[PDB]
Design a protein around this motif. Sequence first.
Motif, PDB file in Angstrom:
ATOM      1  N   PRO B1061       0.834  -1.207   0.000  1.00 49.59           N
ATOM      2  CA  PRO B1061       0.000   0.000   0.000  1.00 49.59           C
ATOM      3  C   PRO B1061       0.860   1.246   0.000  1.00 49.59           C
ATOM      4  O   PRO B1061       1.800   1.373   0.779  1.00 49.59           O
ATOM      5  N   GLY B1062       0.552   2.151  -0.924  1.00 51.52           N
ATOM      6  CA  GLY B1062       1.389   3.296  -1.223  1.00 51.52           C
ATOM      7  C   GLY B1062       1.884   3.313  -2.654  1.00 51.52           C
ATOM      8  O   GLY B1062       2.117   4.388  -3.208  1.00 51.52           O
ATOM      9  N   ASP B1063       2.037   2.146  -3.263  1.00 50.79           N
ATOM     10  CA  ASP B1063       2.602   2.065  -4.600  1.00 50.79           C
ATOM     11  C   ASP B1063       1.578   2.490  -5.636  1.00 50.79           C
ATOM     12  O   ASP B1063       0.398   2.163  -5.525  1.00 50.79           O
ATOM     13  N   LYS B1064       2.033   3.214  -6.645  1.00 46.35           N
ATOM     14  CA  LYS B1064       1.134   3.736  -7.656  1.00 46.35           C
ATOM     15  C   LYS B1064       1.049   2.787  -8.834  1.00 46.35           C
ATOM     16  O   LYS B1064       2.065   2.364  -9.380  1.00 46.35           O
ATOM     17  N   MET B1065      -0.170   2.461  -9.232  1.00 43.42           N
ATOM     18  CA  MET B1065      -0.391   1.655 -10.415  1.00 43.42           C
ATOM     19  C   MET B1065      -1.285   2.414 -11.366  1.00 43.42           C
ATOM     20  O   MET B1065      -1.920   3.399 -10.995  1.00 43.42           O
ATOM     21  N   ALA B1066      -1.343   1.929 -12.598  1.00 39.92           N
ATOM     22  CA  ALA B1066      -2.097   2.616 -13.624  1.00 39.92           C
ATOM     23  C   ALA B1066      -2.460   1.638 -14.718  1.00 39.92           C
ATOM     24  O   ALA B1066      -1.774   0.643 -14.939  1.00 39.92           O
ATOM     25  N   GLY B1067      -3.556   1.927 -15.388  1.00 36.60           N
ATOM     26  CA  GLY B1067      -3.912   1.252 -16.611  1.00 36.60           C
ATOM     27  C   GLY B1067      -3.259   1.952 -17.771  1.00 36.60           C
ATOM     28  O   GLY B1067      -2.355   2.769 -17.605  1.00 36.60           O
ATOM     29  N   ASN B1071      -6.208   5.637 -16.061  1.00 32.89           N
ATOM     30  CA  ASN B1071      -6.858   5.132 -14.861  1.00 32.89           C
ATOM     31  C   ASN B1071      -5.816   4.789 -13.807  1.00 32.89           C
ATOM     32  O   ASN B1071      -5.622   3.639 -13.446  1.00 32.89           O
ATOM     33  N   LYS B1072      -5.140   5.813 -13.312  1.00 31.64           N
ATOM     34  CA  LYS B1072      -4.087   5.575 -12.349  1.00 31.64           C
ATOM     35  C   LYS B1072      -4.667   5.479 -10.949  1.00 31.64           C
ATOM     36  O   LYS B1072      -5.875   5.585 -10.735  1.00 31.64           O
ATOM     37  N   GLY B1073      -3.791   5.263  -9.985  1.00 35.03           N
ATOM     38  CA  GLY B1073      -4.211   5.234  -8.608  1.00 35.03           C
ATOM     39  C   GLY B1073      -3.241   4.487  -7.734  1.00 35.03           C
ATOM     40  O   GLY B1073      -2.758   3.415  -8.096  1.00 35.03           O
ATOM     41  N   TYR B1228     -10.347  -8.370 -17.891  1.00 36.04           N
ATOM     42  CA  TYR B1228      -8.904  -8.471 -17.750  1.00 36.04           C
ATOM     43  C   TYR B1228      -8.266  -7.203 -18.285  1.00 36.04           C
ATOM     44  O   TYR B1228      -7.835  -7.150 -19.432  1.00 36.04           O
ATOM     45  N   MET B1229      -8.175  -6.184 -17.450  1.00 38.26           N
ATOM     46  CA  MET B1229      -7.424  -5.014 -17.840  1.00 38.26           C
ATOM     47  C   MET B1229      -5.947  -5.250 -17.605  1.00 38.26           C
ATOM     48  O   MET B1229      -5.543  -5.817 -16.596  1.00 38.26           O
ATOM     49  N   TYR B1230      -5.151  -4.820 -18.565  1.00 35.63           N
ATOM     50  CA  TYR B1230      -3.702  -4.903 -18.516  1.00 35.63           C
ATOM     51  C   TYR B1230      -3.194  -3.761 -17.654  1.00 35.63           C
ATOM     52  O   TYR B1230      -2.992  -2.654 -18.137  1.00 35.63           O
ATOM     53  N   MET B1231      -3.009  -4.017 -16.369  1.00 34.53           N
ATOM     54  CA  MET B1231      -2.546  -3.000 -15.438  1.00 34.53           C
ATOM     55  C   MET B1231      -1.033  -2.887 -15.479  1.00 34.53           C
ATOM     56  O   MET B1231      -0.335  -3.873 -15.699  1.00 34.53           O
ATOM     57  N   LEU B1232      -0.530  -1.681 -15.245  1.00 33.92           N
ATOM     58  CA  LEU B1232       0.893  -1.388 -15.211  1.00 33.92           C
ATOM     59  C   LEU B1232       1.349  -1.182 -13.776  1.00 33.92           C
ATOM     60  O   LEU B1232       0.577  -1.311 -12.830  1.00 33.92           O
ATOM     61  N   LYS B1233       2.619  -0.836 -13.612  1.00 36.88           N
ATOM     62  CA  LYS B1233       3.136  -0.381 -12.325  1.00 36.88           C
ATOM     63  C   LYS B1233       4.146   0.721 -12.586  1.00 36.88           C
ATOM     64  O   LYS B1233       5.121   0.503 -13.301  1.00 36.88           O
ATOM     65  N   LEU B1234       3.934   1.882 -11.994  1.00 39.17           N
ATOM     66  CA  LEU B1234       4.817   3.005 -12.220  1.00 39.17           C
ATOM     67  C   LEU B1234       5.868   3.077 -11.125  1.00 39.17           C
ATOM     68  O   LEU B1234       5.720   2.484 -10.059  1.00 39.17           O
ATOM     69  N   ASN B1235       6.952   3.795 -11.398  1.00 39.39           N
ATOM     70  CA  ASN B1235       7.981   3.946 -10.371  1.00 39.39           C
ATOM     71  C   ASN B1235       7.807   5.228  -9.574  1.00 39.39           C
ATOM     72  O   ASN B1235       8.740   5.996  -9.373  1.00 39.39           O
ATOM     73  N   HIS B1236       6.601   5.470  -9.104  1.00 34.11           N
ATOM     74  CA  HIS B1236       6.409   6.380  -7.985  1.00 34.11           C
ATOM     75  C   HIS B1236       6.257   5.566  -6.711  1.00 34.11           C
ATOM     76  O   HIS B1236       5.261   5.645  -6.008  1.00 34.11           O
TER      77      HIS B1236
END
Lengths: 278, 1340
Positions: B1061-1067, B1071-1073, B1228-1236
């Motif tokens: 919890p804290g890590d930022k993900m995005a589509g 659709n980030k968050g 099935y959305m292809y979710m990413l992971k950002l480096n924030h």
Amino acid sequence: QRVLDATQLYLGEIGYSPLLTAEEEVYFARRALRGDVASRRRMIESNLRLVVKIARRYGNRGLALLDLIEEGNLGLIRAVEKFDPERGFRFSTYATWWIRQTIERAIMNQTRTIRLPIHIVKELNVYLRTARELSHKLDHEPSAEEIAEQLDKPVDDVSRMLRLNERITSVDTPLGGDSEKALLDILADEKENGPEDTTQDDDMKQSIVKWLFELNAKQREVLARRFGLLGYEAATLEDVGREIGLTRERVRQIQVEGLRRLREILQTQGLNIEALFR
Amino acid sequence: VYSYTEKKRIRKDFGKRPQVLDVPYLLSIQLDSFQKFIEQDPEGQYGLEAAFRSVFPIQSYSGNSELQYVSYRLGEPVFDVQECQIRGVTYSAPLRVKLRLVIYEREAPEGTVKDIKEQEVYMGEIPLMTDNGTFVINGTERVIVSQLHRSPGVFFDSDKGKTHSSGKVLYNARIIPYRGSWLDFEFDPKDNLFVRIDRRRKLPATIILRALNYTTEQILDLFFEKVIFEIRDNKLQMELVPERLRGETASFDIEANGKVYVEKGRRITARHIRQLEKDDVKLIEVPVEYIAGKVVAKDYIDESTGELICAANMELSLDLLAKLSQSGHKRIETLFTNDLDHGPYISETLRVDPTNDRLSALVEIYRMMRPGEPPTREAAESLFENLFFSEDRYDLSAVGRMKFNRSLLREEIEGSGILSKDDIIDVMKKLIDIRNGKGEVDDIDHLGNRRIRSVGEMAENQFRVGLVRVERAVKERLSLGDLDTLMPQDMINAKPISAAVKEFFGSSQLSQFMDQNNPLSEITHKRRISALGPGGLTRERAGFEVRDVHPTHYGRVCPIETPEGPNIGLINSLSVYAQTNEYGFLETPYRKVTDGVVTDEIHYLSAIEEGNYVIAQANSNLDEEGHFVEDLVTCRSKGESSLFSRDQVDYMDVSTQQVVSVGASLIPFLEHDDANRALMGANMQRQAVPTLRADKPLVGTGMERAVAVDSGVTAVAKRGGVVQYVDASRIVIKVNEDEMYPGEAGIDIYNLTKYTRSNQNTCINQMPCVSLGEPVERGDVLADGPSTDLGELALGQNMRVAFMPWNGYNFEDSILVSERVVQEDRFTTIHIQELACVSRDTKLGPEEITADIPNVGEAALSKLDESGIVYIGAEVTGGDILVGKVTPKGETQLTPEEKLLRAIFGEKASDVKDSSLRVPNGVSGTVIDVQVFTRDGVEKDKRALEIEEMQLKQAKKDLSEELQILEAGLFSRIRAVLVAGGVEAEKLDKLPRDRWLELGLTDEEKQNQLEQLAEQYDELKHEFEKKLEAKRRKITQGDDLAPGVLKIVKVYLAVKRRIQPGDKMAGRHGNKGVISKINPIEDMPYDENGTPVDIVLNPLGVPSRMNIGQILETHLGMAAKGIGDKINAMLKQQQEVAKLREFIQRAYDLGADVRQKVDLSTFSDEEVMRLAENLRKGMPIATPVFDGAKEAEIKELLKLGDLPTSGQIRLYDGRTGEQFERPVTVGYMYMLKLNHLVDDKMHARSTGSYSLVTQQPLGGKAQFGGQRFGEMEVWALEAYGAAYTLQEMLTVKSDDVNGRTKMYKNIVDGNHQMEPGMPESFNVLLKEIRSLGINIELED
């Protein structure tokens, strides 16, 4: 109405003296060297264009142009001070030495913020000239080892003299390109302790005083004058021998006894040598 | 048909538009510009030969000596890119310029030379561009971003603002060259024409006319036209042209031959012009009122004495008429002026002109440009000629001359790069016509007025900037001193040129780090079109026009890929197919419509050429012959669109992708998203951290494979062949026969890159995808890079998602994540940092390196070896010692408390202080690499000797491997020679390999191919030993460290960061968050089959942000995953390859009118098996950008699986098991992971290190610093009643130096009081104001 910058006014000004002929120069120096100040004024006032011509070549070093001109002026004043017309030479040949050398010493002096002496700067210029001539032989940057090879001087000496060519940076320049972070934001005040180390020391001092008064009086007076701690001066075992207890060996004995008692007292509070010294 | 990399997993494609052009190789800009730059261009056009032949020959100060240029040549780099990324040096190559110093003889102006001397000299070192478009500068990896600047040449802008307090527009020309002084011609509000040169003061523009040696009669004669009058002893008669009365008013009767055409009070209509051209009248009469204001054209001297009756540009008066007639003049020239067609602007400006002669004009320009100092006869005109007419200080370009002669309508497109008289006169006449109405103003944002500078162009400009200073120094060396017979090796200093080119490549505005945390991020950093930098504007004065999109951007620049923030639309990204002109304006392909059919002659059209034709759209249906399906087809003619007839069109677009960039060509259902969320998706897709095991896009775009291949992250085969051997770090291809060149015995060795760090500290790592014994072809992908999978871009991991609000934990943009995600390690990125430890030579003595460090116990010294460095593989964590560095110090003078302490414990004082490199706080990694550098002459310790032994054994094994496996291929081809013409099936196997390449055959080429492979092998035999000694002396030599540093020890931690919890993900759609709860597997909702959904997403973020594309991405993800599970069910039991072929072929058939009909009857029951094993996690589906997947195809896909056609199933709750009402959307959305990442964001300081001059805390998280309590927060605290909080905040939490230790001792002694005092920064302000002459004092 001239535009009022310092360079244009000066360079327009200096042309108001006709350049002197050789017999003219010799006669003016004959009048000058016996103490007629008008002749000195005429000789220095005319050859200012020589100083601008000579100091034209020394541009784009550390000094700005008018600094170079004004420092050449000092040497020109020195040159008319010590010119000889009896050698029959043209004045320009003799004054060129003085003006060129007193602008060279100016660039050696007033350039570096940390002032290196003359001989260090001449020694560094020897190495930089050697590196400039060595770069065309191996088509890369000549090392400290390469310059030490080509001059057969020790590698540590050339390394030291090149490290004395540091080009001392500014602080106020920003970092990373973006103008938000200069070296004031990066540098930390290293000599000033923060509140943590400053309160550890005061707590340690009060703890030391408390443990010493927890120790008996004859031991703690030896251990107080021994280190200058409890409002005393740091005295010798011979000194407190003559001052308090006449047997110096017994002073060593009571010191070792007090140190053992304080070792026990410290380790009762869990502070061992691993605790205070990691 | 498909390659053997595509028979693995063939991605199903919904493209309906039949493609015509391939996607071109995406890195053409950077590679082609640097190939133009460093190239022996035989004519002086491109790069170095152009720059040299520009600035050379340099001659002396007419000192009968000239330094000329012969030819140059580039050296070999002593370090290739891997060794120079390790070593920290640049990747450069030296240019040994062959020069020649000529000496003209005395009494020989163009006599012969007594002394010439050719001498090959060195200067500078140009960094070579690597094979991907990157440089290596000081160990790092930089990308020179291409710049879009305004095209040199004339530029007729208007004003179009108020700027007058009346609203009149004031047109101004502006002549920008590539290098030289500017020139404007602005109008004044009184219709005065004012030149200005480099934006100095306004002077009247006829001054520069006179400076071109023009008298005032010629100045009138160019810009005006004649009305010859007539004196038939009286009557003031007039030679009439009838078209001169266009809009004029006749207050008299215009009468000729006694015939009436116009009358008083009748205004002169064109009917009277028709009467006049019917009557063909030359000479008319006009009354005495007519020549009362006519301005004469020439100086009319007296007939008798030649005294000036009237000079030129003088209005004729009636007494002037009488004086001119009584002198005896008859014909009078004047100017046809008008307030509609020919305004007398040159005449009025000539009146306001305070100049009269050419020399006075030169003096006026001299007193404008270089003010104050008086001119000579010579220096004024010399300044003026050197302004605009010198090849050294003025140069438009070839481009500037092209844009110039195309803007003032000349037939040539080339000429003199400097101006001329007719150039300036034509610009003036065009500006005047633009005032009178004929001709329109340009616009800067139009991409026919905007170039593209690149690495070749800007690097050649920097090389010219170095060479002009070398020309100044060479003119200083040449004319001064001697002649000499001196050689041209000391007249040229290498360090200015190297300084200039390194100052560009090292730190320019455009020399930026490669943001290396994707393949995608690398490509879209290289394909950047920024408008900042040298010759470009800044963010502060970038108005709303260059931020804006243009109707010319289509096909050239992406409209949805620009970083939002301060520079929106200044850091534009290049479109996919967008090429670049010869000159540099962005041209784009279009396929030509002929008579009615779209012929595939793909023409690249630039911007200004685009502005003429009528270009169709890519969504124009073609009836399989070439004709358009409709009879009228939408298109766009000149900026605006239309609906033109289907014969009217002239071009059709190439493909649906050509407007968007390569970054935004990866969002599936782009056209359903709003443009804002598409912009955020394109900006966030290039920050995705490459995970532990990258998956696939289950909903892809087809540009996955082209982006993955066209970056330098993977290892593609160069010559197709059979795989011989695949390790975890190397691949050995044996080359097929026909693709093998007959000299070598081809075995390509691809050595992969394993676990090295990026610029952003991620794990750039290459794992092989092929297996042993597998035939691969040319261009086939062998090893996946980072974030790749089978040669497709896989930036993220696709997860089973659902849209429902779950108990508030996914409130604004927060995101639940099931715990089974982190059990599967789907997002566990690896970060590899580098820690360094220099061992300088302090004046107290050298800092040593050993493992005897004072005041540290054995608990930290366990992990180091005896040589003071840590063990490779050691699991280090927060605070442990990596490299133990003892540093000498002296004059301790201990306080008596520490004296008593060291006497209590018997401890000795330590003359060496501890400056050991320890791990930073928080990071707990695994030490994977220690690189020990040493200055030459310093003794290596046991660790560095061990590492050099290991590296030498590795390099010797490497050369032995290349020689031995090349020997294996060599004798394999020798055996292939030895099975024809003298075949010895066992006799060749009888005698050993000493004589296999010396075996007796027939008199063919194969006999001297045995000897050719023999001399090949003996060449390798000497090459192995010589290159072995080369590598050995290259390893065992010293290093080129900084002055003063002895050894540098780099230790490479490797952290395997989880998600939390804290890590930022995005589509992919904005659709980030930041994820918010690692929910367990039970609480996450499950559908009625048992499967917990993996990510619960908030629905209300959809219809306000309008990224409705992700609903369809989710639905098609559910479709594709349904197909994957159907094949997985057919594979769980062993069904049959036949029924599997039936089902997979049925899955590739639907829907309607798609390309790539893939016929599974040509698959040979192993590739169906191997294709099933790859599809079994989900059939990957290509949905191109604006070709799309229509929803009926999605419904048919959902009916191919057993799924419901809504895409909406009945989720059940987690914690209760009551079914959710109103069934939810899962897919099935292809979710990413950002480096924030939150561990890089979280930071807190109690009491750390204060800054130097003002005792205040430092910056964020690197110097362990306090958060800034800026002035807005001060206003927020003042806005409450809070005074004590604010006082302690800017007094004792921050600045009062004696105050905060009292604050701390109050805290630790259990009393929360404060004794505030006065902040130190105010004392600094006191002493700073007072260090002017300003006595500022505190009084009481």
